[PDB]
Symmetry: D2
Subunit: 476 residues, 4 copies
């Protein structure tokens, strides 16, 4: 078989479990054989619409069978898939389509308006039209080092992370090594497949294991609770906010959750209170740390250590290597702070048409996360902060997230930011929404003096749309 990439997956799965159900969405159920044939038809269709090896095909739409069909079809046509972030403005879609140089944009009816407003040598086709009339799979030569997809990463305009067929395959291998999945898996995907997390951590590994991927086009806590008991979901991925919204809904206590085997949380660390609430209900989080550039898995905190290592990001996935390094590039003394750097077959080729930006951050197979961390005696990592947020005050490092985290012990939302100073170069400045007074004096009971902000401004709201933004700087 000449196609070694994701394009071949539907065909390989169909030889193994043709009649097993692969995708559920509204009333739509696709078996593996139905997926293979629908993929082979869209591939031949992209060929006929003039798609050639290395060409980019964008998808603008929600979690939906068309997402996976476009993904596998691209692979089958030797093309590069581009899953757009469906929440972005026209200017931003335009930027993503210009940069990737997409030659075809496949979209769902609800985006038809927005698609018609996009900047003219792009073939914009509604999902289902482009599909052709052969349903025998193409077998084009695709190696694992060939780019499978461009995933745009939000300090500059967005950059396309080049994830190879190899990157996503080896990420799925990592998941199968560290988590226990089976043939009879029923995985609920209510996080977006346009993020590496839903796609890499749950969708692809469930399809590869011959289980069922249940897609929701939207996140609703209630639909997720109903889905869990009605569909007998074994496997869910979410970010803390999605598990917060689920636990907080009226039917949290009423819903039957005995079917859940594996609850994956990524994106950010699970707050202690949230982990405790799921634990109280018999549910333990597997916590993942990762990034787009690692396709995305890097560290796993297993359900056994979730309580024993509170707000650890965990240990390396099997085929990855992870270290904390200085600016010096060398490993730091254990317990000391440095930058998480990642290496392995899951790590990206680079940023699409940005080779210099790539070289700042990728070198000798090692990717710079932009995360400050410590490694404890047991090789468990502890994320401190974003290296970009770091304040330098009389040559001493201040991690806002440490100072912020103390401010939250005070009787809503806060940001600590760097501010020029005539003699220290930079000094802390707390921005707080509440009912006030100068209790920086409380912070002086809690922090190294030099870490305490020298000023505190009260406000009414902060740019907290992130679901906080360092545009707080702009309001110094």
């Amino acid at each position: 078989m000449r196609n070694q990439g994701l394009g071949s997956w539907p065909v390989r799965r169909a030889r193994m479990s043709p009649h097993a159900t692969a995708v559920r969405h509204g009333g739509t159920a696709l078996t593996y054989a139905e997926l293979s044939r629908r993929v082979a038809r869209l591939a031949h269709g992209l060929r006929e619409a003039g798609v050639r090896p290395g060409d980019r095909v964008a998808y603008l739409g929600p979690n939906h069978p068309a997402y996976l069909e476009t993904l596998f079809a691209c692979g089958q046509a030797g093309a590069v898939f581009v899953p757009l972030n469906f929440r972005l403005g026209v200017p931003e879609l335009d930027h993503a389509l210009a940069d990737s140089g997409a030659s075809v944009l496949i979209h769902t009816p609800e985006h038809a308006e927005t698609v018609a407003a996009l900047a003219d040598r792009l073939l914009r086709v509604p999902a289902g039209e482009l599909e052709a009339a052969d349903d025998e799979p193409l077998d084009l030569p695709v190696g694992l080092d060939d780019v499978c997809l461009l995933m745009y990463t939000s300090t500059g305009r967005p950059k396309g992370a080049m994830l190879t067929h190899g990157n996503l395959t080896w990420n799925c291998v990592n998941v199968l090594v560290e988590t226990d999945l089976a043939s009879d898996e029923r995985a609920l995907v209510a996080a977006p497949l346009f993020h590496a997390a839903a796609l890499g951590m749950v969708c692809l590994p469930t399809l590869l294991k011959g289980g069922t991927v249940i897609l929701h086009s939207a996140f609703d806590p209630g639909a997720v609770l109903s889905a869990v008991e009605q569909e007998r979901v074994t496997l869910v991925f979410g970010v803390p906010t999605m598990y917060q919204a689920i636990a907080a809904h009226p039917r949290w206590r009423s819903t039957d959750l005995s079917s859940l085997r594996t609850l994956l949380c990524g994106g950010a660390p699970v707050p202690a209170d949230l982990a405790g609430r799921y634990l109280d209900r018999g549910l333990a989080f597997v916590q993942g740390y990762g990034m787009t550039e690692a396709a995305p898995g890097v560290l796993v905190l297993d359900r056994a250590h979730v309580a024993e290592k509170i707000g650890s990001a965990g240990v390396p996935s099997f085929f990855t290597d992870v270290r904390v390094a200085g600016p010096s590039g060398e490993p730091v003394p254990p317990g000391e702070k440095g930058e998480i750097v990642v290496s392995g077959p899951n790590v990206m080729k680079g940023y699409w048409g940005r080779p210099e930006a790539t070289a700042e951050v990728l070198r000798d197979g090692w990717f710079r996360s932009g995360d400050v961390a410590t490694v404890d005696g047991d090789g468990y990592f502890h994320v401190v902060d974003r290296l970009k947020d770091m304040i330098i005050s009389g040559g001493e490092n201040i991690y806002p997230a440490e100072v912020e985290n103390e401010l939250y012990g005070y009787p809503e939302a806060c940001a600590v930011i760097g501010v020029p100073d005539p003699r220290w170069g930079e000094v802390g400045k707390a921005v707080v929404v509440p009912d006030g007074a100068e209790l920086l004096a409380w912070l002086r009971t809690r922090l190294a003096g030099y870490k305490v902000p020298k000023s505190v401004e009260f406000t009414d709201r902060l740019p907290t749309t992130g679901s906080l933004k360092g545009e707080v700087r702009r309001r110094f």
Copy 2:
């Protein structure tokens, strides 16, 4: 991490589950951390004994922790491991050591006599001596295309199958894709680790998943039954003969088997009667077809189809491609006979220092199994016979195994062999152990005339040590 091969596995597993038990043998229990440190010490030890990248280290001994320690140590030293078949004569050991050019032979006390009789620029050291006094892992550069081990294949002298770190890694990925293993796996290894089957199908995948490998230096049906209930085994690999011996032992009915989740059978097809007996007891066989040259997995018949497709070899493992091909090299019309040929990342680099012999059988990534087969409408394969046993009679193919299989319906053991003929070029000759008469007339009720042997010789015993041999030819 520069070592991408099996040598790195103990270190990667120890970052993940240090305190979980990896190996049980007599009273010996090794945790992953204990395995990593023991491996790092044997690696440094091999270095100090003058082992350099690409050097061969042989192991002569039974299933035992020293087997895995030598395997991982070789990998860690950038060396090539050579697991000898412990049942072979001195002349045959000599041939395997000459051909591989082993520079170190590590052995267990019981083989000390035999090792002292071996032909003088070989360093012969008992297991445990060579071990050194650093226990920090070496990180030498090892790629997946580097040879991990030489596995000798029984029509000529034995040939060393070069299995790369890549071959064994991708075989383990295949196993994790098609079978459901967990962190809490307890796998019994009473088949020899010097075969690709025990090593590739069970041992490596169980270690990679963070479970426990229970080794028995010998096959005893009784010890296996006791082991299953006393140790709570979830996972067993065997050949039909080993499952035949287990089911036939006094304590078959008495033994508690509720712990068994996955029963793997390989080597040959499970006789209907044997599959039925395990089924009657609630136990379903996953059947594997494979060969040394595929590291070794190729086809899987899952527990769901074990009854529905009796004596099918099954469908391709996910990352493999399998076809029946003519001498013409092309796929054959469905249902027609041809040679199973295998392709994929599990398939060997070639036979050690035999490039011409390799080229007869490996070409464009495709390996010739030497197995005649058919593929049915559902893509399920059916092994007919060994291409080498095929008889050509007036230009028509006779598969002895088909004729033999009819002879076994007659009221012990039989072989059908080719025999020169003045006008047909070759003709059948049945060799039977019983009480006789010429009931080739019964075969004429059952077979195409041209397939019926033209003569039948009765005998007392046949070379049935294989646990039949085409040395029956020699007694034409």
Copy 3:
């Protein structure tokens, strides 16, 4: 340097010989310094026009600096170059553009009309020299030797040969190993650069060596002779028909040829007449055999061995392996006929979008030439015919070239071609198509009767049809897609 491909060549060469003349075209000369600045301006320009890694850029025009600028600019932009046969009509160009999926076409002004008529909605049509951006700093995109450099179309429908950066780099290494080029070469490219021959055998190796490529937009033997003595050409590539026209020109005696060091001849063998005419003016041919799919070098017959091994295609280039194989695939009894099969780092990735057609001719890195040949005890290859021109008649093979060779011995046969035609008795039978000399009269029955004299009856065509002209390539090979016409 992250770009290992041809896109990095102008920057690697500008570091060593910045002020040496790289390209001469009439009154225009680029130094290596200027080539690198122009290539980098065009690569930036292409990217501004939406060119991204793997996109296809086509060039329509003759031998021109813009050919080499577009080639190198594509590599620098991580893109794939598509050199179009500039003699094609718009239906054939439409096919090449659609199959390739070119999203940009650069053309010289004489193709403005052809370009206006192309099937194009998502093709940017650009006149050469209108996409030169302000930024002249070389881009350094990650490009490996296994990345595709260009699609070169075959003469079924045209198939796009995927030549990698490695394929073309290793062809140049083959040329440097077997031919003696120096930093003062003055190479005349009067054959088309859209063929592998001029590009791979003369153009790129000369640029690699810091030499001067002299381009002619067209072949005129009179321009070639003026150029050799005026420009002191050291190196020429041509097919035998070019070298014939050069020798049959009135200024062949008066032209100073003393500068000529290396005469490369490919496409077909040099007739004994041709060798003799050049021998007597001191000039010997290095004869090469190759194909598009080997980028293109495979065999060479050097000037030292043209004497004893007459009509040989010669011996393998250093990094290339060459064999004659059975219809099986297995090597043949030495002396007997089989197919030339080629292996090495010069051999293509496969045909673009045509994986099944690729697998029929490319397995285990061995390419099926479609050439029938023998190999002698000395490893010298002898090309007999094209496999697909074979005529099977009562289950015996007939080699038409053996028959055409005999037909040339008959008074007033100026050109001919023997094709397979269906027949119920024999499956196939030969038909001769013969072009008579303008001042010669030929009886069909006498011609056939005379062949029967010379050949086993099974080889002799059953019929003869006369014509004024046969379908010949720009070079002068008979298409044999005159099966269609008779």
Copy 4:
């Protein structure tokens, strides 16, 4: 052909120029045909003696056909060649054999005693020419360009540079691109083949081009001159000390040097005296800079640019990238000092069994030269000193070569060396070690007092110790492991 490595070179070359002389050594000449038969006999012989893929075979002896036979036979047997420094004592050879893990040692008869004293239990000791098997059919084992061809030991303890088949192949491509070699080269190898210079810059490229390698077992300027005029040498490699001894010989005027086309000089820059002495006999040096770990080519200063860019190490070879980097790793303000870092397919796999020492100097395919240098506006490199010879004195850098350069200007300083010596005030301070001319008397205090005249006080050594001779390499570089002696 499954062997892509140097092991296949004798068979690839026997196909093209079988009867051309490949190697001449006094009265012995091998044709390419005979080299291939001998290499194949030895490869079979090695395998009979238990040599398998990846095993190490060492050669102890001078420049000799057996060097090249063992090299190519190792490749053909899938094995790794270990060319030992034949000037080493048995403790240093024992180290090289133990670190390499050689399981076979081929030696010429003059090393019979040294070889008898080696620490060996599992080493087969073999006299050259005693492992020639009957089978002369080339083996074709699978060998990739990334397989290790040879371990070349560094001058800590010696480190084994893993040079791949690719590394050495791509060095030869670099040589063919930048130097004008032809099939009639007659290359004199009077420098040792156990160094990368003679092997990679002259020997292998000449064999690739179907030329003749003329080997001398020893360097004697009188033999070199006789050989040039008698053998009509076209190509020579040497370090400046070899070219100095050749020019200071009585038969330099009477020797016909007219055959010389290419003079390659590596190791160190040619003094202005040397260039002038060769200029006046019509001869110009192609000057190369390189190291073992780049197989070894990196920079070249061609004869066309030796005039204006005096003391330059020149510009990068075509397939090699070269930069000056901060202690950071980042490129430096142009004109300022940093370390030469090298990238390209010629750069080694790493040091054998020494992955940590490798990672200190080799990341992202960039190798740290240990050379301090500047680059000018023209991309020409200027080597200043070795990084590890730097003297840090009150946190200021002192370049000893800048100080030794000034010391050479003082009456009767024949040789000298400046080393770092510990000091409590400044961390480090310089000490001069000076060899006086046999007929010169020098006051230490006056020498230092005069340096103070010429240099900032912080650069001037605090002490001077006199000696009769300094530790110099076979070439003539000062070891600087005279730190040990003073």
